[PDB]
Motif scaffolding. Structure first.
Motif, PDB file in Angstrom:
ATOM      1  N   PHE C  97       0.908  -1.106  -0.009  1.00 48.06           N
ATOM      2  CA  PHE C  97       0.199  -0.027  -0.002  1.00 48.06           C
ATOM      3  C   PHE C  97       0.760   1.093   0.089  1.00 48.06           C
ATOM      4  N   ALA C 124      -7.165   6.244   3.723  1.00 42.34           N
ATOM      5  CA  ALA C 124      -7.606   4.632   3.468  1.00 42.34           C
ATOM      6  C   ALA C 124      -6.443   3.872   4.180  1.00 42.34           C
ATOM      7  N   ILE C 125      -5.221   4.097   3.967  1.00 44.72           N
ATOM      8  CA  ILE C 125      -4.160   3.580   4.557  1.00 44.72           C
ATOM      9  C   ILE C 125      -3.930   3.508   5.959  1.00 44.72           C
ATOM     10  N   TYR C 128      -6.736   1.365   7.327  1.00 44.13           N
ATOM     11  CA  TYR C 128      -6.460  -0.144   7.807  1.00 44.13           C
ATOM     12  C   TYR C 128      -5.299  -0.181   9.017  1.00 44.13           C
ATOM     13  N   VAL C 160     -17.812  -8.194  16.528  1.00 45.20           N
ATOM     14  CA  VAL C 160     -17.220  -7.239  17.293  1.00 45.20           C
ATOM     15  C   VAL C 160     -18.567  -6.023  17.588  1.00 45.20           C
ATOM     16  N   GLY C 161     -19.223  -5.852  16.279  1.00 48.00           N
ATOM     17  CA  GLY C 161     -20.279  -4.864  16.609  1.00 48.00           C
ATOM     18  C   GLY C 161     -21.160  -5.574  17.644  1.00 48.00           C
ATOM     19  N   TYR C 162     -21.427  -6.460  17.899  1.00 51.59           N
ATOM     20  CA  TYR C 162     -22.413  -7.108  19.023  1.00 51.59           C
ATOM     21  C   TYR C 162     -21.669  -7.112  20.563  1.00 51.59           C
ATOM     22  N   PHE C 167     -24.180  -1.302  18.040  1.00 50.11           N
ATOM     23  CA  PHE C 167     -23.136  -0.418  17.650  1.00 50.11           C
ATOM     24  C   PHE C 167     -23.890   0.704  16.844  1.00 50.11           C
ATOM     25  N   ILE C 177     -21.250   7.645   8.984  1.00 49.82           N
ATOM     26  CA  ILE C 177     -22.231   7.307   7.853  1.00 49.82           C
ATOM     27  C   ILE C 177     -22.942   8.417   7.254  1.00 49.82           C
ATOM     28  N   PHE C 180     -20.761   9.239   4.368  1.00 53.25           N
ATOM     29  CA  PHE C 180     -20.929   8.446   3.260  1.00 53.25           C
ATOM     30  C   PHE C 180     -22.039   8.636   2.354  1.00 53.25           C
ATOM     31  N   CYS C 247     -13.808   6.097  15.068  1.00 48.29           N
ATOM     32  CA  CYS C 247     -14.919   5.301  15.803  1.00 48.29           C
ATOM     33  C   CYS C 247     -14.250   3.846  16.210  1.00 48.29           C
ATOM     34  N   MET C 248     -13.506   3.538  15.498  1.00 45.82           N
ATOM     35  CA  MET C 248     -12.702   2.100  15.860  1.00 45.82           C
ATOM     36  C   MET C 248     -11.682   2.169  17.029  1.00 45.82           C
TER      37      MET C 248
ATOM     38  N   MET D 208     -21.623   1.431  -2.574  1.00 44.72           N
ATOM     39  CA  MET D 208     -20.914   2.672  -1.654  1.00 44.72           C
ATOM     40  C   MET D 208     -19.502   2.916  -1.516  1.00 44.72           C
ATOM     41  N   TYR D 209     -18.730   1.816  -1.057  1.00 46.83           N
ATOM     42  CA  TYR D 209     -17.301   2.146  -1.149  1.00 46.83           C
ATOM     43  C   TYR D 209     -16.873   2.534  -2.246  1.00 46.83           C
TER      44      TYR D 209
HETATM   45  C1  BCL Z   1     -23.266  -5.466  13.791  1.00 47.87           C
HETATM   46  C2  BCL Z   1     -22.153  -4.733  12.835  1.00 47.87           C
HETATM   47  C3  BCL Z   1     -22.672  -3.085  13.053  1.00 47.87           C
HETATM   48  C4  BCL Z   1     -21.491  -2.301  12.330  1.00 47.87           C
HETATM   49  C5  BCL Z   1     -19.895  -2.631  12.968  1.00 47.87           C
HETATM   50  C6  BCL Z   1     -18.945  -2.055  12.388  1.00 47.87           C
HETATM   51  C7  BCL Z   1     -17.578  -2.502  12.534  1.00 47.87           C
HETATM   52  C8  BCL Z   1     -16.784  -3.473  13.560  1.00 47.87           C
HETATM   53  C9  BCL Z   1     -16.817  -1.485  11.639  1.00 47.87           C
HETATM   54  C10 BCL Z   1     -17.792  -0.702  11.047  1.00 47.87           C
HETATM   55  C11 BCL Z   1     -17.099   0.150  10.021  1.00 47.87           C
HETATM   56  C12 BCL Z   1     -18.007   1.141   9.209  1.00 47.87           C
HETATM   57  N1  BCL Z   1     -19.361   0.986   9.377  1.00 47.87           N
HETATM   58 MG1  BCL Z   1     -20.485  -0.152  10.610  1.00 47.87          MG
HETATM   59  N2  BCL Z   1     -21.584  -1.457  11.234  1.00 47.87           N
HETATM   60  C13 BCL Z   1     -22.920  -1.747  11.174  1.00 47.87           C
HETATM   61  C14 BCL Z   1     -23.605  -0.949  10.574  1.00 47.87           C
HETATM   62  C15 BCL Z   1     -23.448   0.030   9.423  1.00 47.87           C
HETATM   63  C16 BCL Z   1     -24.150   0.489   8.349  1.00 47.87           C
HETATM   64  C17 BCL Z   1     -25.722   0.499   8.159  1.00 47.87           C
HETATM   65  C18 BCL Z   1     -26.315   0.980   7.078  1.00 47.87           C
HETATM   66  O1  BCL Z   1     -26.200  -0.185   9.057  1.00 47.87           O
HETATM   67  C19 BCL Z   1     -23.296   1.583   7.607  1.00 47.87           C
HETATM   68  C20 BCL Z   1     -23.931   2.412   6.628  1.00 47.87           C
HETATM   69  C21 BCL Z   1     -21.801   1.309   8.172  1.00 47.87           C
HETATM   70  C22 BCL Z   1     -20.882   1.911   7.617  1.00 47.87           C
HETATM   71  C23 BCL Z   1     -19.810   1.889   8.323  1.00 47.87           C
HETATM   72  C24 BCL Z   1     -18.539   2.769   7.776  1.00 47.87           C
HETATM   73  C25 BCL Z   1     -18.632   4.178   8.707  1.00 47.87           C
HETATM   74  C26 BCL Z   1     -17.148   2.173   8.428  1.00 47.87           C
HETATM   75  C27 BCL Z   1     -16.711   1.240   7.125  1.00 47.87           C
HETATM   76  C28 BCL Z   1     -15.970   1.964   6.135  1.00 47.87           C
HETATM   77  C29 BCL Z   1     -14.581   2.073   6.203  1.00 47.87           C
HETATM   78  O2  BCL Z   1     -14.128   1.546   7.308  1.00 47.87           O
HETATM   79  O3  BCL Z   1     -13.495   2.581   5.415  1.00 47.87           O
HETATM   80  C30 BCL Z   1     -12.074   2.549   5.743  1.00 47.87           C
HETATM   81  C31 BCL Z   1     -11.426   1.922   4.646  1.00 47.87           C
HETATM   82  C32 BCL Z   1     -10.592   0.678   4.723  1.00 47.87           C
HETATM   83  C33 BCL Z   1     -10.476  -0.121   5.861  1.00 47.87           C
HETATM   84  C34 BCL Z   1     -10.061   0.121   3.503  1.00 47.87           C
HETATM   85  C35 BCL Z   1      -8.556  -0.360   3.367  1.00 47.87           C
HETATM   86  C36 BCL Z   1      -8.108   0.302   1.949  1.00 47.87           C
HETATM   87  C37 BCL Z   1      -6.728  -0.448   1.535  1.00 47.87           C
HETATM   88  C38 BCL Z   1      -5.679   0.413   1.967  1.00 47.87           C
HETATM   89  C39 BCL Z   1      -6.792  -0.451   0.116  1.00 47.87           C
HETATM   90  C40 BCL Z   1      -7.007  -2.062  -0.235  1.00 47.87           C
HETATM   91  C41 BCL Z   1      -6.398  -2.378  -1.774  1.00 47.87           C
HETATM   92  C42 BCL Z   1      -6.768  -3.846  -1.877  1.00 47.87           C
HETATM   93  C43 BCL Z   1      -6.083  -5.051  -1.244  1.00 47.87           C
HETATM   94  C44 BCL Z   1      -6.270  -4.066  -3.524  1.00 47.87           C
HETATM   95  C45 BCL Z   1      -7.010  -4.900  -4.378  1.00 47.87           C
HETATM   96  C46 BCL Z   1      -6.675  -4.649  -5.764  1.00 47.87           C
HETATM   97  C47 BCL Z   1      -7.405  -5.290  -6.763  1.00 47.87           C
HETATM   98  C48 BCL Z   1      -6.416  -5.359  -7.929  1.00 47.87           C
HETATM   99  C49 BCL Z   1      -8.648  -4.463  -7.450  1.00 47.87           C
HETATM  100  N3  BCL Z   1     -22.073   0.359   9.200  1.00 47.87           N
HETATM  101  C50 BCL Z   1     -23.727  -2.943  12.102  1.00 47.87           C
HETATM  102  C51 BCL Z   1     -24.514  -1.949  13.182  1.00 47.87           C
HETATM  103  N4  BCL Z   1     -19.034  -1.149  11.289  1.00 47.87           N
HETATM  104  C52 BCL Z   1     -15.540  -0.246  10.103  1.00 47.87           C
HETATM  105  C53 BCL Z   1     -14.726   0.926  10.519  1.00 47.87           C
HETATM  106  O4  BCL Z   1     -15.050   2.080  10.610  1.00 47.87           O
HETATM  107  O5  BCL Z   1     -13.159   0.780  10.377  1.00 47.87           O
HETATM  108  C54 BCL Z   1     -12.433   1.685  10.435  1.00 47.87           C
HETATM  109  C55 BCL Z   1     -15.445  -1.139  11.228  1.00 47.87           C
HETATM  110  O6  BCL Z   1     -14.399  -1.714  11.434  1.00 47.87           O
END
Ligand code: BCL
Ligand code: BCL
Ligand code: BCL
Ligand code: BCL
Ligand code: BCL
Ligand code: BCL
Ligand code: MQ8
Ligand code: PGV
Ligand code: PGV
Ligand code: H4X
Ligand code: H4X
Ligand code: CA
Lengths: 73, 43, 272, 318, 41, 257, 72, 41, 72, 42, 42, 41
Positions: C97, C124-125, C128, C160-162, C167, C177, C180, C247-248, D208-209
């Motif tokens: 990355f 993003a990094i 992660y 983890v959420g529960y 959560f 959210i 987003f 948040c995490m 969305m992502y």
């Molecule tokens: C029961 C579970 C809970 C819940 C438990 C959790 C937990 C636990 C987490 C979240 C996290 C998130 N939750 Mg939540 N969440 C719930 C319900 C929701 C709902 C909904 C409509 O109900 C929504 C809209 C969301 C939305 C979200 C976002 C705010 C966040 C995820 C985006 C993110 O982490 O980006 C960040 C981006 C990354 C981590 C991406 C990393 C990118 C890397 C660097 C690049 C990778 C490239 C790849 C390997 C390459 C492939 C290449 C190919 C060639 C194509 N949750 C329910 C209530 N939620 C996550 C969070 O906030 O983490 C920070 C998280 O850990």
């Protein structure tokens, strides 16, 4: 009148584009074909899983060779 | 029209060596499979 | 292959490490030192994921899983078959990355432009690294991070959420959210507007900037402008990522009750 | 470092712009435009004027009737006290009818107000749709903003009207609150076995992502070539300059393929619309066709299978 | 509006009607076979 | 029985297939729209011959933009205007090698200093007037106090030396905002600098331009008429300032570490 | 009429031949994949029906494998 | 409209119809074999 | 029915031969991988069927391994 | 022509294309006969 | 003249439009008579 | 182009083949030692 009232009908293609209309008709017909087949397959009229004229999975489970192998286990 | 700029003589030359190399590679593959069948037959 | 106009821009220079040794292209791609690094690490990581699938029970694509160590390992080093493979792959991932971001910086320097895209990628990094490094370190164990598997990292997310009963009531989660959702709305409106102005009603001329301002002032009463919508875009996406990281880092290290009980600070203010 | 182009350093004013001339037979625009210095630090400073015709007044009457109803019921739920309203505001809501009433019209304090507010909000959004369409079409532009709006309205009607009717109960619809609607979200996932194993839910999350990724990428790329006049996209489309050339070389060199200055906007359009299309498809099948998404995923070979080591005895079998 | 004259429109209409009639004939035949095999009403 | 199965085929399955096919098909159409600029591409062959290739999927059929105020038709994909005359030497003898400029790198039009060949007409407003104009031609504009008026300040140039002094502001009438600063240079010519390459310090009353050096402000391209600017001239000016990001100092193109 | 379809060859003066050919080929491949997948998901499946014999079951009950599994 | 004259269209039509007929023949043959092996109605 | 496919070679006057060759090769490789993976996921699988013998089971019951597991 | 090939070049290409496709299909048939002998699936 | 049709063109269009609508409604009535004979709903 | 003449290619080929042969020799030696220590087949 009741026979001469559809005379100028051929002029329809002077206001509607023929190629666009043809393509639209063909695409709509394909979509409707897929849809009606899926709607009939999801009812009591389904013809792939009705086990007529015979059930083939059930036929494979009761072949004598498979039965004799399952007995040795 | 797509061309490569090779004449017909250059293409003949390239083809000769390409076919020789491919044949040698396939020979080595066959040998590897005969050894594997002797050691651990899979069918 | 080169585009019609590409040749006059393929000059040397602009690099960070290396120099003239890795300054070439392979097809359309530009390589560089960090290009070599990125492909090296991506290949190694992929092959190790595949091997970890080979020693598991199935090669079905949906059911592969490589899991982190147990919580008793702490911040130490786990056996290869019980966690160490996960650690090696998570080193490869970071390497890949960061290499990606620095290659972007080299390219932008060569073309003469600003460093906005690698800077936005940095967040993003950061999210992660929060999930695999910062939160595990603050809680005291690598086994707090997620496993590598489709469908199998989703079980992690769920449990983890529960662990906090509900959560949805996490405040930084609500804020992220919000960002987003607003980002998807803004992207739909921007796409629609530009398409609409260069693809007008049949038999009309391409419209202008005045039309772009007028349409949104007619519908809504305010128009932000053609350069500020790009800014608003960078802003909403970056903020989404940032508040996810917050948040995490709050959950576990700084709060161990249910999340609904945090909000109790509001109706307990002595002012109603 | 170098200027990043995030804020406007010097501002300039001219008299307000009234707007492109409308077709003859139109109503005048209402309001005298004002200027905001703080809004001008980041964008355009003019506010107003506004166009109010036939469809945008019927909308705004419907919407405000709905808002009055929702607000008053939230206020009746605390005994009319505004102090308690502010104190417990995130926990209040207007609740749907009890599920035993089916699709009939229930009495007013047991779900009829919910039904009224839903009807008026619906009418508001359809009138607004017509306004958006006509506003874009009277200026001679393509109607692309109405297609996306139609998709969003369809998702609002699916969860809320279409799915409750196909199920046979109004009590299957969300309430009007903040914490109440979050509770609805969690409960519908719990009842129909884990939305993480719904495949349309996974695909909409993918999109969305992707919306966030794509808009970070585009916003960055256009701010990074704005020194070569890249923020003026219409001219870069109808007469390609060096800003567009650099913008497309960057992505070609980085990941091997690129778009053009006009095509990237089609990618944006589609990434925002597939998210909601999959939203509709995932909600419309839940309950009416599939009763447990986890068991579905197990039947189609999708769910992982953790090792067991124990045996737990189901006490209903004993 | 479409650039077709009246003769071209007459020609297109002739062939369009023939094709539509043939298509509907095939549809009717398919339904007669289906009724013989699996009557639904 | 907890996990009993009645039938394997259901509607969710079919609908998922339909979606896989509806995606996979907008990709096709978007990828075809992506190739209305810059194609057909040039593939270099085994021993240097260049052919035109077109990719996968193939290029679309041309569409027409009708520009306003009798600004002509634009067909895309269509012809191209001819490149100017850049000189370049390859560094290593293979198709994927890089190039070096031959003469003075600042005045060469290669690398970050390349530009496009646009029309020789100004960009217009909805009424037909030129869009970017000096504030003496647009007589209704005014700088908002609360903001530093740059007229009068100096133009320090990235090595500490003075470039000249600001004498005019160039505004944008379609969207009211500043686009260029005009300054008088060391040899008494009038040159422009884009506002997105200027850091304005109100108290020091300076404008810092990190791109080029102080002596470099004498060779910035000039305009024909000073009451308007055309698309071509915009490109030339901006590109000259962008060449300095890599060519101003001989150490700028030379591997940080 | 028997002679209703005489001008039919003029179809290719309004519809593009090459694009139509490509469309037909791609549609046929997609439909082939779809029908094979629809029939494989039904009672008519022919890969897993264990006809004419089940091969995994055949491998589990070979005398050599049985004798090795007994020694354990 | 497509640039083809009437002779070119006639030529294309000839070969198109021949190819479509051959394809449908092969389809019919596949279905006869499948009915002999595993009748589905 | 003897001369109806005469002009068929004029296919290559509307389809580019090199593009077509590349497309065919890529499609064939993709289809090869797909069919092998579809058959490996069924009862016809030939790597795990333990025919002609099971090798992991053969290794678990070697006399040396058995004697080492005994003394434990 | 829109591919640049004349009619002679097209005839040549067609000859070799058909020969190659026939040989490929022959090899496919042979593979299936061997598989049927080893593990019949119908 | 807002649509560019003269009065003669409008008369022509109106004639055929009314004929077509009448035929369509006739077919609808026939479908409902058949449905009532098969499965009466009131 | 790669720009190499035929003489330069001959030179490069000489040294390339020598180096590859030496590398493979070392690989064979490593495997003989590993077989002596821990036989895997
Ligand atoms: C029961 C579970 C809970 C819940 C438990 C959790 C937990 C636990 C987490 C979240 C996290 C998130 N939750 Mg939540 N969440 C719930 C319900 C929701 C709902 C909904 C409509 O109900 C929504 C809209 C969301 C939305 C979200 C976002 C705010 C966040 C995820 C985006 C993110 O982490 O980006 C960040 C981006 C990354 C981590 C991406 C990393 C990118 C890397 C660097 C690049 C990778 C490239 C790849 C390997 C390459 C492939 C290449 C190919 C060639 C194509 N949750 C329910 C209530 N939620 C996550 C969070 O906030 O983490 C920070 C998280 O850990
Ligand atoms: C139970 C199964 C058997 C087994 C069955 C087979 C079978 C069957 C085959 C192999 C083949 C290979 N196996 Mg084995 N193999 C086993 C275990 C191993 C182990 C290990 C750590 O356990 C390793 C590292 C290898 C490694 C290898 C490679 C040497 C070779 C594939 C190379 C390639 O992909 O060329 C791709 C590279 C090119 C096409 C490059 C072209 C030319 C280049 C410049 C030169 C490459 C040198 C080449 C690698 C070696 C050729 C021999 C030289 C004269 C030294 N096998 C087990 C014991 N293995 C394949 C093979 O033999 O190839 C002939 C093959 O068919
Ligand atoms: C109990 C249900 C019956 C059944 C009841 C019906 C009924 C009733 C009908 C069909 C029809 C169709 N059925 Mg069925 N069908 C069953 C099971 C199948 C199965 C299967 C996998 O089980 C398949 C693959 C089919 C497939 C088909 C298609 C051939 C056809 C839909 C055509 C279309 O959409 O054109 C739409 C596309 C266009 C119009 C574009 C232009 C088409 C051009 C002109 C060329 C297309 C060729 C055409 C499809 C066939 C002509 C072949 C002859 C040699 C002329 N059915 C079961 C046994 N089926 C319909 C049909 O036969 O139409 C005549 C129809 O009325
Ligand atoms: C119980 C079900 C039967 C079965 C019932 C049927 C029925 C019924 C049909 C098929 C058809 C096909 N089946 Mg089957 N099929 C079964 C199992 C299989 C298996 C397998 C792994 O089990 C495979 C790989 C196949 C594969 C195929 C393809 C050859 C073919 C669809 C072609 C296509 O998509 O053209 C679309 C692509 C194009 C039009 C592009 C242009 C094609 C060009 C001209 C060249 C392609 C060659 C062509 C595919 C084959 C003809 C070559 C001959 C050797 C002369 N079947 C089981 C045993 N199968 C169809 C068929 O035979 O077509 C005539 C068909 O009607
Ligand atoms: C139970 C089922 C059987 C099985 C049944 C079949 C059937 C049936 C077929 C195959 C075919 C193939 N099998 Mg098998 N196969 C099995 C086990 C294996 C295993 C393994 C690790 O177990 C492997 C690696 C293979 C690999 C292969 C490939 C050689 C071949 C697919 C070629 C391709 O995709 O061309 C796609 C690529 C192109 C067309 C590009 C152009 C190719 C160019 C011209 C040259 C490539 C040559 C090619 C590799 C063939 C070499 C032939 C030479 C005369 C030596 N099979 C099991 C035992 N296999 C297919 C085949 O034989 O094709 C002839 C085939 O029909
Ligand atoms: C118990 C209920 C009855 C039933 C009661 C009714 C009643 C009552 C009606 C229909 C009507 C229709 N039914 Mg029904 N129908 C039933 C079951 C079916 C089934 C099925 C799979 O079970 C299907 C596929 C249909 C399909 C149809 C359509 C043919 C028709 C709707 C036309 C339309 O949508 O206009 C939409 C499109 C247009 C208006 C475009 C305008 C016309 C254009 C130019 C071309 C259209 C051609 C037209 C579709 C076909 C008529 C042509 C004749 C061969 C002459 N019904 C069951 C058995 N159905 C309607 C009808 O027949 O209309 C006359 C109707 O009134
Ligand atoms: C891996 C392997 C086997 C390697 C062997 C090959 C070897 C030996 C070396 C090759 C050399 C190197 C260094 C290669 C590295 C590349 C490799 C291998 C992999 C990377 C590929 C990769 C990461 C691709 C991911 C692509 C995806 C999924 C993108 C997601 C976003 C998306 C769908 C975007 C589509 C829309 C696009 C094209 C946006 C770009 C875009 C944006 C965003 C604008 O704003 C803009 C503005 C004005 C004009 C143009 C543009 C423009 O094109
Ligand atoms: C920047 C983000 C974090 C900053 C905040 C750090 C503040 C507090 C962190 C310390 C809290 C750790 C958790 C304590 C509770 C869990 C038990 C524990 O582990 O705490 C202690 C360890 O503290 C430790 O690492 C302490 C290590 C802290 C070092 C942090 C520095 C990071 C820099 C690295 C960059 C490269 C006791 O360790 P042991 O039990 O002997 O270890 C046994 C097992 O780990 C291995 O067999
Ligand atoms: C004697 C009685 C006097 C009535 C005289 C007035 C004539 C009736 C209204 C005129 C009219 O119907 O006009 C339309 C207004 O639509 C509108 O109210 C639309 C709103 C009408 C319905 C209001 C209630 C809504 C009904 C439920 C929701 C329908 C949802 C449908 C959405 C797709 C269009 O408006 P404009 O094109 O902007 O106006 C231009 C000129 O006509 C006037 O400057
Ligand atoms: C000018 O001179 C030139 C250069 C032009 C001369 C050139 C001429 C040449 C070389 C011409 C070559 C022409 C060729 C090779 C032509 C080939 C033509 C073919 C093969 C045409 C085939 C057409 C087949 C069709 C249209 C089949 C359509 C089938 C349909 C629409 C069926 C649909 C089934 C449905 C909807 C049901 C679904 C069933 C289920 C259960 C899945 O539903 C859910
Ligand atoms: C005190 O306040 C005053 C009165 C002064 C005004 C202030 C207003 C305030 C503060 C309001 C606060 C509002 C809040 C917080 C609202 C929260 C809203 C949220 C988050 C809502 C989320 C979801 C609700 C949804 C999706 C509802 C969907 C409902 C639908 C689609 C209804 C459909 C019903 C229909 C079409 C009617 C059918 C009826 C009939 C008659 C046909 O039945 C037979
Ligand atoms: Ca079978």
């Amino acid at each position: 009148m009741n026979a001469k009232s559809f005379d100028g009908m051929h002029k329809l293609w002077m206001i509607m584009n023929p190629v666009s209309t043809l393509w639209a008709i063909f695409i709509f017909q394909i979509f409707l074909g897929l849809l009606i087949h899926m709607v009939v397959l999801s009812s009591d009229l389904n013809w792939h899983d009705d086990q007529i004229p015979v059930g083939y999975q059930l036929q494979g489970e009761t072949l004598p060779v498979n039965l004799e192998m399952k007995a040795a286990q | 029209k797509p061309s490569t700029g090779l004449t017909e003589s250059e293409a003949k030359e390239f083809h000769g060596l390409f076919m020789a190399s491919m044949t040698l590679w396939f020979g080595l593959v066959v040998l590897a499979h005969i050894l594997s069948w002797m050691y651990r037959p899979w069918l | 292959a080169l585009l019609n106009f590409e040749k006059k821009y393929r000059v040397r220079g602009g690099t960070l490490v290396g120099g003239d040794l890795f300054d070439f292209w392979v097809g359309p791609f530009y390589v560089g030192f960090f290009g070599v690094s990125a492909v090296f690490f991506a290949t190694l990581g992929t092959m190790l994921i595949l091997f970890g699938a080979a020693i598991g029970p199935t090669l079905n694509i949906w059911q592969i899983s490589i899991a982190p160590p147990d919580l008793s390992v702490g911040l130490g080093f786990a056996p290869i078959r019980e966690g160490g493979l996960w650690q090696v792959i998570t080193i490869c991932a970071v390497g890949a990355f960061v290499s990606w971001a620095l290659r972007q910086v080299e390219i932008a320097r060569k073309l003469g432009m600003g460093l906005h895209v690698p800077f936005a990628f940095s967040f993003a990094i950061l999210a992660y690294l929060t999930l695999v490094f910062f939160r595990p370190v603050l809680l005291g164990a690598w086994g707090h991070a997620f496993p590598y598997g489709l469908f199998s990292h989703l079980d992690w997310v769920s449990n983890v959420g529960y662990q906090t009963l509900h959560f949805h009531y996490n405040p930084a989660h609500m804020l992220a959210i919000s960002f987003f959702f607003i980002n998807t709305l803004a992207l739909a409106m921007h796409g629609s507007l530009i398409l609409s102005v260069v693809n007008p009603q049949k038999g009309e001329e391409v419209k202008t900037a005045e039309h772009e301002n007028t349409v949104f002032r007619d519908i809504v009463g305010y128009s932000i402008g053609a350069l500020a919508i790009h800014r608003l875009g960078l802003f909403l996406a970056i903020n989404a990522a940032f508040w996810s990281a917050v948040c995490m880092i709050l959950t576990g290290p700084f709060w161990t009750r249910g999340w609904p009980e945090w909000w109790m600070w509001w109706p307990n203010l002595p002012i109603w | 470092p170098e200027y990043q182009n995030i804020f406007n350093k010097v501002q300039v004013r001219e008299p307000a712009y009234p707007g492109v001339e409308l077709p003859k037979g139109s109503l005048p625009r209402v309001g005298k435009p004002i200027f905001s210095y703080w809004l001008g630090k980041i964008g355009d400073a003019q506010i107003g004027p506004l166009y109010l015709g036939g469809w945008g007044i019927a909308s705004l009457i419907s919407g405000f009737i709905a808002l009055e109803v929702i607000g008053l019921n939230m206020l009746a739920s605390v005994g009319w006290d505004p102090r308690l309203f502010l104190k417990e505001f995130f926990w209040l809501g207007l609740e749907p009818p009890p599920p035993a009433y089916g699709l009939s019209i229930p009495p007013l304090a047991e779900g009829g107000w919910w039904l009224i507010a839903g009807l008026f909000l619906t009418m508001s959004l359809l009138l607004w749709w017509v306004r958006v369409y006509k506003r874009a079409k009277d200026l001679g532009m393509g109607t692309h903003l109405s297609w996306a709006f139609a998709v969003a309205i369809l998702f609002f009607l699916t969860l809320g009207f279409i799915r409750p009717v196909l199920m046979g109960s109004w009590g299957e619809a969300p309430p009007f609150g903040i914490f109440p609607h979050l509770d609805w979200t969690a409960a519908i996932s719990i009842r129909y076995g884990n939305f993480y194993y719904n495949p349309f839910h996974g695909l909409s999350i993918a999109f969305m992502y992707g919306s966030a990724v794509l808009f970070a990428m585009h916003g960055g790329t256009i701010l990074a070539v704005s020194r070569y006049g890249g923020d003026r996209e219409i001219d870069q489309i109808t007469d390609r300059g060096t800003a567009a050339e650099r913008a497309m070389l960057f992505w070609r060199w980085c990941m091997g393929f690129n778009a053009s200055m006009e095509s990237i906007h089609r990618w944006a359009w589609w990434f925002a619309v597939f998210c909601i299309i999959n939203s509709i498809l995932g909600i419309i099948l839940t309950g009416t066709v599939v009763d447990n998404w986890y068991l579905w995923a197990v039947k189609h070979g999708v769910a992982p299978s953790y090792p067991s080591e124990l045996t737990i005895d189901n006490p209903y079998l004993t | 509006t479409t650039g077709l004259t009246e003769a071209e429109s007459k020609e297109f209409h002739g062939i369009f009607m023939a094709s539509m009639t043939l298509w509907f004939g095939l549809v009717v035949l398919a339904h007669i076979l289906s009724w013989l095999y699996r009557p639904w009403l | 029985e907890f996990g009993y199965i009645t039938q394997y085929f259901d509607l969710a399955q079919v609908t998922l297939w339909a979606f896989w096919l509806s995606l996979l098909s907008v990709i096709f159409f978007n990828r075809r729209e992506d190739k209305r600029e810059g194609y057909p591409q040039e593939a270099v062959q085994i021993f240097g011959k260049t052919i035109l290739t077109e990719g996968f999927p193939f290029m679309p059929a041309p569409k027409t933009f009708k520009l306003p105020h009798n600004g002509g038709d634009v067909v895309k994909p269509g012809p191209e205007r001819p490149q100017y005359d850049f000189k370049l030497e390859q560094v290593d003898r293979f198709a994927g090698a890089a190039y070096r400029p031959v003469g003075n790198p600042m005045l060469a039009g290669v690398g970050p200093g390349a530009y496009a060949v646009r029309a020789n007409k100004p960009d217009l407003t909805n009424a037909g007037d030129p869009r970017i104009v000096p504030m003496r031609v647009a007589k209704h504009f005014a700088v908002v106090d609360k903001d530093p008026d740059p007229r009068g300040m100096t133009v320090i140039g990235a090595d500490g030396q003075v470039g000249g002094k600001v004498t005019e502001i160039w505004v944008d009438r379609a969207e009211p905002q500043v686009r260029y600063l005009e300054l008088e240079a060391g040899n008494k010519k009038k040159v422009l600098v884009p506002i997105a390459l200027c850091v304005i310090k109100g108290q020091k009353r300076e404008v810092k331009v990190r791109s080029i050096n102080g002596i470099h402000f004498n060779d910035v391209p000039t305009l024909s008429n000073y009451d308007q600017i055309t698309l071509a001239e915009e490109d030339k000016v901006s590109a000259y300032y962008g060449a300095g990001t890599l060519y101003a100092t001989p150490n700028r193109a030379e591997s940080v570490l």
